[PDB]
mmCIF file of C-alpha atoms in Angstrom:
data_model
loop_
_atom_site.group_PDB
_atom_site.id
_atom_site.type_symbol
_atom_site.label_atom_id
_atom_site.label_comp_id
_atom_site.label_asym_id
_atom_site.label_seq_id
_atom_site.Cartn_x
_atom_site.Cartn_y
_atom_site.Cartn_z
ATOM 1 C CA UNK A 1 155.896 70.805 0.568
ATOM 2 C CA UNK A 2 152.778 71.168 2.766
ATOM 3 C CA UNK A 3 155.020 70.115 4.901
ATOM 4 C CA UNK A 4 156.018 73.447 6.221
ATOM 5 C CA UNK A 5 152.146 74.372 6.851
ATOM 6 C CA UNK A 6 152.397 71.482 9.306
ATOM 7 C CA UNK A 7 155.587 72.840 11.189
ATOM 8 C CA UNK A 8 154.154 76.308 11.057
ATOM 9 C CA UNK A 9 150.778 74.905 13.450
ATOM 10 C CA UNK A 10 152.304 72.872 15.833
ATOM 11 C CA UNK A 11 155.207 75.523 16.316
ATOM 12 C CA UNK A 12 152.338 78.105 16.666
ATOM 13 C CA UNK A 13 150.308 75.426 18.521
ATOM 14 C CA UNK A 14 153.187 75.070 21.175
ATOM 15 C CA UNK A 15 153.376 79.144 21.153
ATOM 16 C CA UNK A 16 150.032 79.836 21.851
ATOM 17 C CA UNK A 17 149.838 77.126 24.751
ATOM 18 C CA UNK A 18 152.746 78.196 26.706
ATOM 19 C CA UNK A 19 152.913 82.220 26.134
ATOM 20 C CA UNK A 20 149.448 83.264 24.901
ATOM 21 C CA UNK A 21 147.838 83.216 22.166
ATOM 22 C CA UNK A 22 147.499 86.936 22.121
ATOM 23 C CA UNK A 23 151.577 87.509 23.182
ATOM 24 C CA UNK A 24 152.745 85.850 20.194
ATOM 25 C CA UNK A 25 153.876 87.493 17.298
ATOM 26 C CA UNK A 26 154.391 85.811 13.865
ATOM 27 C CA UNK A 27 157.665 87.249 14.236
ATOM 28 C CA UNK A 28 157.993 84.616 17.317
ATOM 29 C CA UNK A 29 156.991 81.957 14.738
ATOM 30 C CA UNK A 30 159.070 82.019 12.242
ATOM 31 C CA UNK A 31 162.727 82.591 14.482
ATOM 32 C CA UNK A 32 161.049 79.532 15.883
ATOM 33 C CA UNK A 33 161.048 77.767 12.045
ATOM 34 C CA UNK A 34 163.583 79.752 10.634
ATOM 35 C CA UNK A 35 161.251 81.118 7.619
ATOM 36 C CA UNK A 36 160.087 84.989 6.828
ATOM 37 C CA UNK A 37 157.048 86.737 8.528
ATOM 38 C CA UNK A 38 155.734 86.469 4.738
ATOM 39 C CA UNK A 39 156.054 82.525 4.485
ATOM 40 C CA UNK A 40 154.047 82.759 7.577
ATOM 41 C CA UNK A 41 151.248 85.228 6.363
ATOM 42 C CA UNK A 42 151.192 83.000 2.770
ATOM 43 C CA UNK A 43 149.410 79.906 4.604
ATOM 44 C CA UNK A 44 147.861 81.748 7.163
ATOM 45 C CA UNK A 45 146.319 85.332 6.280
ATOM 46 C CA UNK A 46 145.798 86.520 9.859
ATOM 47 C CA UNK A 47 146.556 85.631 13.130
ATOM 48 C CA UNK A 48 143.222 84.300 13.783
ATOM 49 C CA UNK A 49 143.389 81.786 11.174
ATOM 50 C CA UNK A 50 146.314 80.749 12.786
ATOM 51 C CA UNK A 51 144.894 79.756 15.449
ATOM 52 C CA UNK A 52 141.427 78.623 13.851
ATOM 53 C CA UNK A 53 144.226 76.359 12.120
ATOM 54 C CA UNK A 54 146.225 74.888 14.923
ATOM 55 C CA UNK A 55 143.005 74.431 17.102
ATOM 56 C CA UNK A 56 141.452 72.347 14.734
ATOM 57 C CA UNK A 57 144.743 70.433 14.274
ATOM 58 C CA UNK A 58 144.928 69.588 17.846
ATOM 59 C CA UNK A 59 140.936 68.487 18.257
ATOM 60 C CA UNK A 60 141.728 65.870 15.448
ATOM 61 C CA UNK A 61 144.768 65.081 17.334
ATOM 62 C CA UNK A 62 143.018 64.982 20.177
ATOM 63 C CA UNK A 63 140.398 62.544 19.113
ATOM 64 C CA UNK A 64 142.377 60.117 17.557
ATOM 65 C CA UNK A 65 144.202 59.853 20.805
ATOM 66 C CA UNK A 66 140.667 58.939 22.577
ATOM 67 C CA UNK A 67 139.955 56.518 19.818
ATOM 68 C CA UNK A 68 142.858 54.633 20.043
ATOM 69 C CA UNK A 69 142.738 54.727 23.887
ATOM 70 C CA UNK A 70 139.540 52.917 23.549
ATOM 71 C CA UNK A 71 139.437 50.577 20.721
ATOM 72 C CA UNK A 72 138.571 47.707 22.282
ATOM 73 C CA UNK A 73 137.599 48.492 26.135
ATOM 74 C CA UNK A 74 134.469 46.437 26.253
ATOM 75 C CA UNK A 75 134.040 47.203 30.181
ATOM 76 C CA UNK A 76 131.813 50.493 30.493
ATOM 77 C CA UNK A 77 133.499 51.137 34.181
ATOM 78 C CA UNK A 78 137.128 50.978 32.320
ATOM 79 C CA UNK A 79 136.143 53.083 29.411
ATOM 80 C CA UNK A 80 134.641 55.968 31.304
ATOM 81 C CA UNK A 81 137.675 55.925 33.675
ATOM 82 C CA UNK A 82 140.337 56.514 30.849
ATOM 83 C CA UNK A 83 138.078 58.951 29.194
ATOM 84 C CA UNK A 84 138.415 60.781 32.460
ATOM 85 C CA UNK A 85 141.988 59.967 32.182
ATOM 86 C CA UNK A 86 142.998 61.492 28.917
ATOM 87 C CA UNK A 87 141.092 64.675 30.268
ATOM 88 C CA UNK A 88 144.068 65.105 33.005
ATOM 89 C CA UNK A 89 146.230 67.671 32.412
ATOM 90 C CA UNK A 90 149.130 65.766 32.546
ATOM 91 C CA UNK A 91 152.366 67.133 32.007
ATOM 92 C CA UNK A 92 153.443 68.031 28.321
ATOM 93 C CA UNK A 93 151.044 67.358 25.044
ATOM 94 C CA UNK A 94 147.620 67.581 28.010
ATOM 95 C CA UNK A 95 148.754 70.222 30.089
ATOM 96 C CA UNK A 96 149.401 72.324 26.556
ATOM 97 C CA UNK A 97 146.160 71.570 25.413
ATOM 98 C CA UNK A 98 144.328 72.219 28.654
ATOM 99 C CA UNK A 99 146.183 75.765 28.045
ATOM 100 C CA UNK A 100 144.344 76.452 24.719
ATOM 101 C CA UNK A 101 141.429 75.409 25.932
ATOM 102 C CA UNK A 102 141.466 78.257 28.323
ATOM 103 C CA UNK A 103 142.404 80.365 25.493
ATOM 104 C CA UNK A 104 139.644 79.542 23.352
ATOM 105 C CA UNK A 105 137.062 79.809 26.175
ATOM 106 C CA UNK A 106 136.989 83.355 26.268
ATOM 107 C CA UNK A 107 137.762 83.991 22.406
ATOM 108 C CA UNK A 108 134.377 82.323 22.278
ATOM 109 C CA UNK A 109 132.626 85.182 23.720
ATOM 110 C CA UNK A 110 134.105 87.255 20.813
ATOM 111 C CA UNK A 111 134.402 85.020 17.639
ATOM 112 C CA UNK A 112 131.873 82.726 16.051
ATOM 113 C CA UNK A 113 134.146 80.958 14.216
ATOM 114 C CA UNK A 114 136.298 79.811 17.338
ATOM 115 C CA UNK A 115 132.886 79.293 19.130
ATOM 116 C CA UNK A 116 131.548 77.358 16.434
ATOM 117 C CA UNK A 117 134.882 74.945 15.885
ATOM 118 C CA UNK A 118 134.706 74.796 19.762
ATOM 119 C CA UNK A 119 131.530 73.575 20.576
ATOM 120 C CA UNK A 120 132.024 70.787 17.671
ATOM 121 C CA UNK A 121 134.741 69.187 19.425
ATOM 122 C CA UNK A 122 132.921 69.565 23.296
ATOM 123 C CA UNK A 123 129.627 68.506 21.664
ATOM 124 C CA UNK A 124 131.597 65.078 20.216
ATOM 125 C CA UNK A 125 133.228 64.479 23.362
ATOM 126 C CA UNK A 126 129.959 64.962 25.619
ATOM 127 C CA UNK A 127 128.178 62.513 23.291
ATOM 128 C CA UNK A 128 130.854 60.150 23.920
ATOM 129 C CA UNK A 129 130.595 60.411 27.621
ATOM 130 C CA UNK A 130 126.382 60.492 27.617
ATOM 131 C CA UNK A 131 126.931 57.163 25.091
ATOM 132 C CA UNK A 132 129.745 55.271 27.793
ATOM 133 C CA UNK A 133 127.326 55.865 30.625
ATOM 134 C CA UNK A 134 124.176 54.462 28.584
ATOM 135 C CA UNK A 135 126.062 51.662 27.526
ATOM 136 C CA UNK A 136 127.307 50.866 31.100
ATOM 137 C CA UNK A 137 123.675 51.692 31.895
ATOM 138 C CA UNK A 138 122.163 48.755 29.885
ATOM 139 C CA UNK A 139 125.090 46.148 31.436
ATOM 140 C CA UNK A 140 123.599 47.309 34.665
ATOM 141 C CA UNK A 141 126.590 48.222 35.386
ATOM 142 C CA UNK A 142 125.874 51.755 36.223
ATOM 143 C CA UNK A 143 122.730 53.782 37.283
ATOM 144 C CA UNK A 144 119.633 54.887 35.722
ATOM 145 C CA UNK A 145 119.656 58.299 35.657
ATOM 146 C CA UNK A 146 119.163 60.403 32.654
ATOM 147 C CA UNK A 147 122.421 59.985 31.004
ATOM 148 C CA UNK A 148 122.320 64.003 29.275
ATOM 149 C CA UNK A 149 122.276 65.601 32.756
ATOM 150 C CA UNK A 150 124.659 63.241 34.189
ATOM 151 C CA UNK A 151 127.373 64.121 31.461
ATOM 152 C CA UNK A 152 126.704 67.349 31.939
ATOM 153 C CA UNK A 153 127.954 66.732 35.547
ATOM 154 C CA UNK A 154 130.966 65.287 35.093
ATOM 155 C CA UNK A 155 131.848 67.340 32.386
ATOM 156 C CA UNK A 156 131.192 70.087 33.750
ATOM 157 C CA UNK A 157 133.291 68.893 37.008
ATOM 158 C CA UNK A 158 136.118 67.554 34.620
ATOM 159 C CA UNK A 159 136.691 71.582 33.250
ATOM 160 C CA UNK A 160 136.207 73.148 36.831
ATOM 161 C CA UNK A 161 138.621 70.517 38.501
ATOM 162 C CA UNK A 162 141.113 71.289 35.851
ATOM 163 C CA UNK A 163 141.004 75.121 36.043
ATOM 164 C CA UNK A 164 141.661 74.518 39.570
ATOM 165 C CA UNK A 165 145.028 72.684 38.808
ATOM 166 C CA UNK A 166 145.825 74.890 35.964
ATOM 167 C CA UNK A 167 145.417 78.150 37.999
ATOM 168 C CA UNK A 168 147.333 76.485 41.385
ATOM 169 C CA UNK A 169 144.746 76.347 43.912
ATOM 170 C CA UNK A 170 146.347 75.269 46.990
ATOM 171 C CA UNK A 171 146.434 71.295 47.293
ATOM 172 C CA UNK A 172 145.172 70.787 44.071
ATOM 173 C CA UNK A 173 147.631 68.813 41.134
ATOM 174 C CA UNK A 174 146.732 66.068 38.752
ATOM 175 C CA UNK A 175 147.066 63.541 41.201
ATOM 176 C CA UNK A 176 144.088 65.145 43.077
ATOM 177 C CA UNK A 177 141.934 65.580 40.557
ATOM 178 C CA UNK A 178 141.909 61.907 39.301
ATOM 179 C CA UNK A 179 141.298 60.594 42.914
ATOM 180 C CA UNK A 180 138.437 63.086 42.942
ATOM 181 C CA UNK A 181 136.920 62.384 39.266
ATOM 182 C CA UNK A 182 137.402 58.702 39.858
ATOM 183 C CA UNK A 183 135.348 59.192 43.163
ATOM 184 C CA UNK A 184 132.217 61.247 41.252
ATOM 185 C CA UNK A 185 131.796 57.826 39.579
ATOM 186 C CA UNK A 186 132.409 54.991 42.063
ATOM 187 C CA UNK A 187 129.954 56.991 44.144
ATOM 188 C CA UNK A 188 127.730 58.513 41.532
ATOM 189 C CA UNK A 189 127.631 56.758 38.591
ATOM 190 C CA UNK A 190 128.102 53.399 39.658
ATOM 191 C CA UNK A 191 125.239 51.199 40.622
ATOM 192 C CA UNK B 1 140.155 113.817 42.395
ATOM 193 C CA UNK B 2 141.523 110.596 42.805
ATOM 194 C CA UNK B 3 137.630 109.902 41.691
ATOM 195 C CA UNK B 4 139.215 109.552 37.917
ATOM 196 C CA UNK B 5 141.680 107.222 39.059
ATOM 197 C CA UNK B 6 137.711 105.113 39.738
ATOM 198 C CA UNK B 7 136.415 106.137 36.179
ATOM 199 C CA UNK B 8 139.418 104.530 34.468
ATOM 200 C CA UNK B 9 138.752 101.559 36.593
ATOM 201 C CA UNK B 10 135.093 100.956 35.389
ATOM 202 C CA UNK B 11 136.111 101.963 32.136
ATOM 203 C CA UNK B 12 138.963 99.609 31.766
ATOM 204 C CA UNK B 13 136.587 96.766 33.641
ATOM 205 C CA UNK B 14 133.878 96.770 31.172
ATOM 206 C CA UNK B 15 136.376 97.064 28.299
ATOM 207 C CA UNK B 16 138.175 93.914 29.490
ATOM 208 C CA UNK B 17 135.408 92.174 30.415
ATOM 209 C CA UNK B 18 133.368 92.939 27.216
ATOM 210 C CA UNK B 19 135.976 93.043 24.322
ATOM 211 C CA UNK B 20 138.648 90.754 26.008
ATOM 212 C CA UNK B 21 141.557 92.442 27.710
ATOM 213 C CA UNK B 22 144.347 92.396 24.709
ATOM 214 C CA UNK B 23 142.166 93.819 22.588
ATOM 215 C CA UNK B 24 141.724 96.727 24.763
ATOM 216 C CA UNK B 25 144.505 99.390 23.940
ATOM 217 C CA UNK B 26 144.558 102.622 26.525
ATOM 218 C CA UNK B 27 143.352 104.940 23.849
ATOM 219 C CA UNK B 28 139.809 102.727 23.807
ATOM 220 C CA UNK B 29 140.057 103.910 27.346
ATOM 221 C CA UNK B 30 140.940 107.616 26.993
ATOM 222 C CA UNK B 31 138.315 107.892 23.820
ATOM 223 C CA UNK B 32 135.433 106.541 26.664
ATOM 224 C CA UNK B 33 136.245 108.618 29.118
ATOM 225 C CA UNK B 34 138.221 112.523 27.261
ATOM 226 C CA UNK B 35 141.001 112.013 28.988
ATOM 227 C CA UNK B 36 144.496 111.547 27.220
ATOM 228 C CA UNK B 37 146.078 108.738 26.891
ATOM 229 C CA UNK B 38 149.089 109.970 29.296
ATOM 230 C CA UNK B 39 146.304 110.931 32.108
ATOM 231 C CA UNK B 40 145.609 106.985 31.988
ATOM 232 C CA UNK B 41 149.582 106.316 32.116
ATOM 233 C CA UNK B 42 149.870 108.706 34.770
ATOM 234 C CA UNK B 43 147.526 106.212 37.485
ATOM 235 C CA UNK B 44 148.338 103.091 35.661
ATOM 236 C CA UNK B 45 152.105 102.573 34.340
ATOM 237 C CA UNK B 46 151.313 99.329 32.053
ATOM 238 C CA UNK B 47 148.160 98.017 31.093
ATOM 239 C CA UNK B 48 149.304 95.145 33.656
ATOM 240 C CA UNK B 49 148.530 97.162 36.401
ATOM 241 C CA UNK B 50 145.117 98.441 34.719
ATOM 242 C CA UNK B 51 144.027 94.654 34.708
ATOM 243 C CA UNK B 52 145.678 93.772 38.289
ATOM 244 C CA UNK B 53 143.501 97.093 39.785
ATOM 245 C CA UNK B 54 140.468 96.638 38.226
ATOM 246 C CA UNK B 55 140.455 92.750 39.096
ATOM 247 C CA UNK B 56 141.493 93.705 42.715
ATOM 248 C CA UNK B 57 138.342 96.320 42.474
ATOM 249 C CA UNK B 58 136.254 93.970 40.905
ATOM 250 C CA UNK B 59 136.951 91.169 43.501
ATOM 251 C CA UNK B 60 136.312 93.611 46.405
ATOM 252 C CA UNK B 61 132.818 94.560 44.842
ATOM 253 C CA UNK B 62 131.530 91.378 44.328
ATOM 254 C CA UNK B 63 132.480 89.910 47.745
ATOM 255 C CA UNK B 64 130.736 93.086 49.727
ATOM 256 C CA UNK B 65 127.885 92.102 47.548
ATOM 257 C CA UNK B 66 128.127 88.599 48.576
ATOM 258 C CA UNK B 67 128.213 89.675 52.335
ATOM 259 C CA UNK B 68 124.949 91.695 52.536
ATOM 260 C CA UNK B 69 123.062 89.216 49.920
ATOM 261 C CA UNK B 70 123.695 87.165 53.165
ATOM 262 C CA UNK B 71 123.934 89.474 56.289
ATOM 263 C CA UNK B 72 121.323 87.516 58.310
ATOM 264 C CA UNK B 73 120.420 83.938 56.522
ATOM 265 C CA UNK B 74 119.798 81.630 59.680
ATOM 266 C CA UNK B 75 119.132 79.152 57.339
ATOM 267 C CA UNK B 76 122.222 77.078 56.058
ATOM 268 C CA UNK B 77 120.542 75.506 52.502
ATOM 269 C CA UNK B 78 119.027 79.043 51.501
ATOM 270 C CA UNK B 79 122.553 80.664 52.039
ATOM 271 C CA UNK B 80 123.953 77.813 49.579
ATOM 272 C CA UNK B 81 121.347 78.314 47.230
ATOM 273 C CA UNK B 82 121.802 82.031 48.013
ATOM 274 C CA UNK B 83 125.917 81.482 47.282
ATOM 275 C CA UNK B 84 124.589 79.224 43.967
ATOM 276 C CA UNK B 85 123.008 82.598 42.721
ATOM 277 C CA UNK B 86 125.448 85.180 43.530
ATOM 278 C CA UNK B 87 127.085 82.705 40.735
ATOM 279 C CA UNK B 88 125.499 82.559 37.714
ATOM 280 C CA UNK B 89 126.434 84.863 34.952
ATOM 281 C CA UNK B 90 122.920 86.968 35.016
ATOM 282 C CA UNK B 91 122.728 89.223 32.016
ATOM 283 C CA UNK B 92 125.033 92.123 32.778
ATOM 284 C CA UNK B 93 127.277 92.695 35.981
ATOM 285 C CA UNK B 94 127.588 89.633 37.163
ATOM 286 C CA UNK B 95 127.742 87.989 33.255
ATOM 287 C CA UNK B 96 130.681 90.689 33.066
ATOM 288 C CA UNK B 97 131.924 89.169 35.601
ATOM 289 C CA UNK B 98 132.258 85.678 34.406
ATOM 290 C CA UNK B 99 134.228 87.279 31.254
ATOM 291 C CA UNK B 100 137.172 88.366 33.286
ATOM 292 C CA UNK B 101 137.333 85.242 35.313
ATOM 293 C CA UNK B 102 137.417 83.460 31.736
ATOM 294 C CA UNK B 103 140.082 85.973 31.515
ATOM 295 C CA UNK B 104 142.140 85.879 34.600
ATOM 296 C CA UNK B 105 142.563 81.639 34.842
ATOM 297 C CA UNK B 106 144.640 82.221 31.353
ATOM 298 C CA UNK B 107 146.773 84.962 32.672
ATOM 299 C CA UNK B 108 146.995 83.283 35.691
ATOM 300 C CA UNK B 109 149.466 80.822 33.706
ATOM 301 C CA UNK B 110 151.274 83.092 32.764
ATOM 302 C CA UNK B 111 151.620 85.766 35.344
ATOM 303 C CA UNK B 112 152.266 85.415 39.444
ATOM 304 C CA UNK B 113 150.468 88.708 40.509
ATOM 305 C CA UNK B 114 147.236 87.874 38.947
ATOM 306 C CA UNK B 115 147.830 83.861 39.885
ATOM 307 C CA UNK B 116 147.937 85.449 43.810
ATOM 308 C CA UNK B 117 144.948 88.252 43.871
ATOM 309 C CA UNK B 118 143.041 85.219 41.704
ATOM 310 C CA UNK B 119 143.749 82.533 44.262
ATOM 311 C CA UNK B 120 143.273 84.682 47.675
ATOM 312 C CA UNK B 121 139.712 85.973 45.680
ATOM 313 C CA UNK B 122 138.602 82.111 44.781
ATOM 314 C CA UNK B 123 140.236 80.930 48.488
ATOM 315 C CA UNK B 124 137.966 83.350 49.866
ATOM 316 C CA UNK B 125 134.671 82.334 48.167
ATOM 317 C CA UNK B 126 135.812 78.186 48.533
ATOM 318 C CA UNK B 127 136.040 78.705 52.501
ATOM 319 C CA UNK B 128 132.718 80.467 52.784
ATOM 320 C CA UNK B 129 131.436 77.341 51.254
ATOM 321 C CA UNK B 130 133.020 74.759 52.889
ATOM 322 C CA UNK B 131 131.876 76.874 56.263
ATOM 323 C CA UNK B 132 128.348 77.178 54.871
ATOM 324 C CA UNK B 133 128.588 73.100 54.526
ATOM 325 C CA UNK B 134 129.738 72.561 58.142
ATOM 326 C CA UNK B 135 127.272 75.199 59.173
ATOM 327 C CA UNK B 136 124.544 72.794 57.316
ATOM 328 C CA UNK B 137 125.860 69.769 58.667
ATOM 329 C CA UNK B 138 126.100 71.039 62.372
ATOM 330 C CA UNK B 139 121.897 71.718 61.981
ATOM 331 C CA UNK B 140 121.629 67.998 60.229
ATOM 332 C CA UNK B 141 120.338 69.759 57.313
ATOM 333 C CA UNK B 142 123.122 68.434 55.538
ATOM 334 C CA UNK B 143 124.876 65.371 55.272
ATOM 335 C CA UNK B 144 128.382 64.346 56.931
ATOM 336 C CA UNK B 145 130.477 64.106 54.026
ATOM 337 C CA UNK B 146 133.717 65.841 53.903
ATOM 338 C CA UNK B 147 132.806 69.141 53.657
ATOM 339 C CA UNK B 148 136.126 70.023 51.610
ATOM 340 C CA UNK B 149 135.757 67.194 49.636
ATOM 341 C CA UNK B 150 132.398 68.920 48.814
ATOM 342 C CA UNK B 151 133.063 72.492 48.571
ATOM 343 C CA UNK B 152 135.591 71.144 45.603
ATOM 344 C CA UNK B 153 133.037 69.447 43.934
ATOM 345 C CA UNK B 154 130.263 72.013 44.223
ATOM 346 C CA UNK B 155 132.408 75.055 43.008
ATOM 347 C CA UNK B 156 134.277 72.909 40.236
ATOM 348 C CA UNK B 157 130.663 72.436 39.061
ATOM 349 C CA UNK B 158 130.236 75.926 39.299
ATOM 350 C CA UNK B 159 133.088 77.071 37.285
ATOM 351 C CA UNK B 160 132.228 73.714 34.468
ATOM 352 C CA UNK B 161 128.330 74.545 34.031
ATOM 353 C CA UNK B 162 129.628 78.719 33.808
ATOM 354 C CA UNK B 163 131.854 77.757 30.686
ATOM 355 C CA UNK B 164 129.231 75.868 29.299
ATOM 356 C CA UNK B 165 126.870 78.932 29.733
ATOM 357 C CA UNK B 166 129.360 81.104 28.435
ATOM 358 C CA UNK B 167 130.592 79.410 25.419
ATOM 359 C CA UNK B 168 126.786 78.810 24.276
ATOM 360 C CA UNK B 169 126.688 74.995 24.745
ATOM 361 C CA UNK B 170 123.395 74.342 23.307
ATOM 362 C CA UNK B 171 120.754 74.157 25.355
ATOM 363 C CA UNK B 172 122.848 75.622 28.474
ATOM 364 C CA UNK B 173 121.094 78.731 29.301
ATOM 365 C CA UNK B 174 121.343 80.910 33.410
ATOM 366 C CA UNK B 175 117.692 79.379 34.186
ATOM 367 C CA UNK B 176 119.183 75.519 33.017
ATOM 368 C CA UNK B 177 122.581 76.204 35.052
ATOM 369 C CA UNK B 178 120.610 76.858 38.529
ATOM 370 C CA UNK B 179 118.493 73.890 37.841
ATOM 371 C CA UNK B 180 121.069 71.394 37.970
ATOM 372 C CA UNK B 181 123.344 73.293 41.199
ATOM 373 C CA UNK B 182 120.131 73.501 42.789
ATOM 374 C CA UNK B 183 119.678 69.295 42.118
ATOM 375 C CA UNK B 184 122.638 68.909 43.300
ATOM 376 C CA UNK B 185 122.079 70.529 46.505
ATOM 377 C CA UNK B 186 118.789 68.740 46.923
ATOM 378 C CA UNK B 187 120.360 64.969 46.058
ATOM 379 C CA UNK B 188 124.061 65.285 46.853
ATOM 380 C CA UNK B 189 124.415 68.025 49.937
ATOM 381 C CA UNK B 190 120.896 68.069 51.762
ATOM 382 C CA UNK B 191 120.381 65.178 53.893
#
């Protein structure tokens, strides 16, 4: 009956993404579920670990997702395409984790334990990206330019495109972003 | 001695910016300055407003800043690399800076008034470098590429390589961040 641990993050997961993190009570959490403040505070000492705890639920989450998108995409062109795809923050399961993300930007600058989690998942997801455009690098596929700073781009332009959706700059939306991402790469990446 | 109505500005500023705005109560703000914690109510009814003025005061400050850093720069690729600087999260005001932003794109979710003074503040900043750009391009310093287009790219990178800074990335550091805007510039804006 780990169970309930389970239903406990993804309720608080949902929570944090859609009211902040820091205007959630575990009170809110456990109307949500049904069970006492002190079921709550049993799995998950502080509030903190709560949401050390849900954010490394959703990174594995997340990963699996990428995995699974890519299995088998032998074409280097395809592959870094979706990868920019599953970055969008589409509506729903995305858009919530785009939302945490935010979140756990600036509890970085406090808390080496969210910092450290954090830069575990970025630092696996930029070595992914770097390894795409070396592979599509050796098919000649795309240019030869060092890979590190050129992940480092579009990562970088990936997070400040999506801030601008998040926080409604005028014109922006998902649909905007993916035209623009997709253009960084037929016109900078691609040989 | 509407001067204290100031102090509890730049008191509640560098609070938010270096201890993260919910963990700020009023009392960290009274205790800095000797004033009581109903002097601080008195100016600021909710600690809504406290954010919303000293963002709006913030905002103001770095823009006048922005104006005389260029007052009289004839030439259209030092005022970019100019702009580029005014950017980067140097060690204290400007790195204080950074934190609120960090700060403001979550609340911005989550909270109209802040969405609207953050948007007019960014929308202000974006046109002055979209105008820079056409500025540029009108000398054939720069070449003709949309100059929106551009300005999206250029402060999305911006806002990406600042996270990265800010969330200790390793080996992101200020001095690494201006490296690659300023490549940019030289490969992707100048002609």
């Amino acid at each position: 009956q780990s169970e309930a641990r389970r239903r406990i993050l993804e309720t608080a997961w949902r929570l944090i993404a859609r009211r902040g993190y820091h205007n959630v009570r575990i009170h809110d959490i456990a109307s949500e579920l049904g069970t006492s403040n002190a079921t709550i505070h049993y799995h998950f000492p502080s509030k903190k670990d709560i949401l050390l705890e849900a954010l490394r639920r959703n990174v594995k989450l997340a990963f699996d997702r990428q995995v699974a998108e890519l299995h088998t995409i032998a074409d280097a062109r395809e592959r870094l395409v979706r990868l920019v795809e599953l970055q969008l923050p589409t509506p729903g399961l995305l858009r919530d984790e785009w939302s945490v993300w935010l979140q756990v930007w600036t509890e970085s600058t406090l808390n080496p334990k969210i910092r450290d989690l954090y830069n575990d998942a970025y630092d696996r997801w930029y070595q992914t990206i770097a390894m795409t455009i070396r592979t599509g690098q050796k098919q000649g596929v795309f240019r030869d330019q060092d890979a590190d700073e050129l992940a480092t781009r579009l990562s970088a332009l990936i997070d400040g495109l999506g801030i601008q959706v998040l926080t409604g700059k005028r014109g922006c939306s998902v649909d905007h972003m993916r035209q623009h991402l997709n253009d960084f790469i037929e016109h900078n990446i691609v040989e």
